[PDB]
């Protein structure tokens, strides 16, 4: 809807892209791309664990 970025956060990205020796756009894509992976695995693990508890309660209730 309304994307929000701080002028002090826009600086961090310009600075970190420089450190990484990449463009601000390549840094943004790269970080979004790898943080997407982290998030996917995190959620995979939480759903898997949610599935173990429902497996235990399935047995215990019977």
**Among positions 32, 56, 59, 60, the unique one binding its own copies when judged by CB under 8 A:** 32
Dihedral (Cα; 40, 35, 30, 10), 10-degree rounding = 140
Confirm or reject binding of residue 54 to its own copies (CB under 8 A): no
Q: How far is the CB of 51 from its own copies (least distance, A)?
A: 16
Element holding 11 (H helix, E strand): helix 7-20
Q: Report 2-61 residues binding Na ion (CB under 5 A).
A: 8, 11-12, 20, 30, 52
d(CA 30, CA 36): 10
């Amino acid at each position: 809807i309304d994307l929000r970025l701080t002028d002090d956060d826009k600086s961090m990205i310009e600075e970190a892209a420089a450190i990484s020796n990449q463009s601000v756009s390549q840094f943004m894509l790269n970080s979004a791309s790898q943080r997407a992976a982290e998030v996917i695995e995190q959620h995979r693990r939480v759903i898997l664990n949610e599935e173990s508890w429902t497996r235990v309660m399935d047995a215990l209730s019977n």
